[PDB]
Design a protein around this ligand. Structure first.
Ligand SMILES: Nc1ncnc2c1ncn2[C@@H]1O[C@H](CSCC[C@H](N)C(=O)O)[C@@H](O)[C@H]1O
Lengths: 265, 265
């Protein structure tokens, strides 16, 4: 009689909220997608075990093209759940799926879960200081995406931090590293020459947020562009103007160069 | 020897993650703070019952001034948990607490949970389009703060949405409603005449996010300013120009006027 959008969280199967688990356990059918993000600390098997149900994984086409044919039909006579990494409606187009549910006469509910969008708070950067977000997409063919560069520029001149989601090709199992994101940005800088992202730009890297020991590193591009941040997923952040307390955290916790403590008022 | 910062999530005792619950249970001492925010859908009693431990509530002073005297000592020879509503370290001042742990020779780990910052994705507004965030504070005495008005102007100017946290008197249990927030903004507008917030401004109200039955409403100030959005907590959002898909969600899910499809897109 209902459809639930349930987030699974950041890293492993235990990142689902208690609410999400108790509800998922009682559903008649459970579907899921794992192409919008990467949960590096678990497996489908462990999720199924925890929920105690067989999970039917859908592909991007199954969802985008046939959600109303594959999932909604069952939701009319049963309690159905749709699982996703992180929070189901963050940096996805899943929100529109609720419209499909309504038109199909199916009531839907949303159960949130930890999202990278807020987990960035672990970098020590004030969340309210984050501006517009963007995604660094893999160039393909003669098409080289550059919009994310402009976002950084706009945020930076307002003194705001920029959160950069990194590209993912789930089927090909390719997860863009912070290193690759930095390389691509230097190329865009060369092309546009706006003085937005260079070897001296301070950046922050967060890898495998949600794990007990995520990698949190801060430093200049010249020094981090070749550093090993561990397995994906990775997120990249270009800080804006720092508050002393932010810099203080980047130094003490993320091992940033102590010179950043000296902020130019 | 370890300190765990554990998020309690959005609304009730089941909004904590499975990871957070299990870890909290294994801790010897469990502390909590309910001054940055509150858990309107539950009680300390219900939370204690779920955790199965006695929970010592700490005040802002307890934390800001004496965190290293109250919590850290026990963390030296025991596993200690520090519970906070939402996602740990989202509240501006929490991050610094990790530096205190480091200095005390105590290891700390962060267990995330859903935050309103990401939960707003339920409004159907694209998360990447959210700009700087701000807090609407009750004026008092001869003090009339209005920085939040400027945040809206700067964001909207660049086509970005503004997430507005509403003032809360935690200790006094007083929550600012979206209605009061709208009245304050109209008052500031009349004050600054910047044409940023008026009767014709489109706004979105999200009440009791995390609940299975949150109130999601979108419409013009003139029609929503005296509407009843239910019990707290309330969050106010002033969106920027809308993507057609965002508008359609607001109309289909948030009951917004068809007019937004031509006026705010
Ligand atoms: N645990 C994690 N650590 C670092 N980056 C992460 C992450 N989870 C997601 N991301 C980042 O976000 C991208 C997916 S975007 C979809 C995000 C998801 N709805 C959420 O709420 O988190 C990834 O390619 C990666 O760059």
């Amino acid at each position: 009689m209902v459809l639930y959008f349930i987030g699974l969280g950041l890293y492993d199967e235990r990142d689902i909220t208690v609410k999400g688990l108790e509800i998922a356990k009682k559903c008649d059918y459970v579907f899921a997608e794992f192409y919008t993000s990467l949960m590096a600390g678990t497996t489908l098997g462990r999720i199924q075990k925890l929920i105690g149900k067989e999970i039917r994984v859908l592909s991007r086409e199954d969802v985008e093209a046939n959600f109303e044919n594959i999932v909604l039909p069952l939701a009319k006579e049963n309690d159905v759940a749709f699982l996703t990494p992180g929070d189901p409606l963050v940096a996805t187009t899943h929100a529109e799926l609720r419209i499909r549910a309504k038109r199909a006469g199916v009531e839907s509910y949303v159960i949130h879960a930890p999202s990278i969008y807020s987990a960035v708070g672990i970098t020590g950067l004030h969340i309210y200081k984050f501006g517009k977000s963007a995604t660094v997409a893999y160039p393909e063919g003669n098409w080289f995406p550059t919009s994310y560069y402009d976002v950084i520029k706009e945020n930076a001149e307002r003194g705001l931090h920029t959160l950069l989601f990194l590209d993912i090709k789930a089927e090909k199992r390719m997860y863009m590293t912070a290193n690759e994101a930095m390389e691509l940005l230097l190329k865009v800088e060369d092309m546009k020459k706006g003085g937005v992202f260079t070897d001296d730009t301070l950046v922050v890297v967060l890898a495998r947020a949600g794990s007990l020991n995520p990698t949190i590193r801060a430093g200049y591009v010249k020094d981090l562009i070749r550093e090993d941040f561990g397995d994906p997923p990775h997120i990249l952040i270009v800080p804006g103007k720092l508050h002393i307390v932010e810099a203080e955290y980047l130094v003490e916790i993320a091992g940033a160069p102590r010179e950043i403590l000296r902020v130019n008022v």
